[PDB]
Symmetry: none
Subunit: 44 residues, 2 copies
C-alpha cells in the first residue's frame, strides 16, 4: 500500500532528472550561441 508511493514519486523524480537535463541542454545551446553572437562574459 506504500510500495506504490515509492513508485509514484520515484517515477516523477526520474522524469524530473530527465526534464531538467533537457532544459539544461537548451540552456547549453543558448550559452554556446551567446559566445558566438558576442564575446560573452568570461567567468570560465
Amino acid at each position: 500500500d506504500f510500495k506504490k508511493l515509492y513508485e509514484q514519486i520515484l517515477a516523477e523524480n526520474e522524469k524530473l532528472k530527465a526534464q531538467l537535463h533537457d532544459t539544461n541542454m537548451e540552456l547549453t545551446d543558448l550559452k554556446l550561441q551567446l559566445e558566438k553572437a558576442t564575446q560573452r562574459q568570461e567567468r570560465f
Copy 2:
C-alpha cells in the same frame, strides 16, 4: 518507517521542482537576450 519513505523521494522531488523552475526562467532569459544580440547576462 514509511513516513520517511515519502519524505526522502519527495524532498528530492521538491529540490528538482525548484532548480528546474530556475533553469526554465534563466533559459527564457538566455533565449530572449541571445537573439536580441546580447553581450552579458546575470542568470542567478
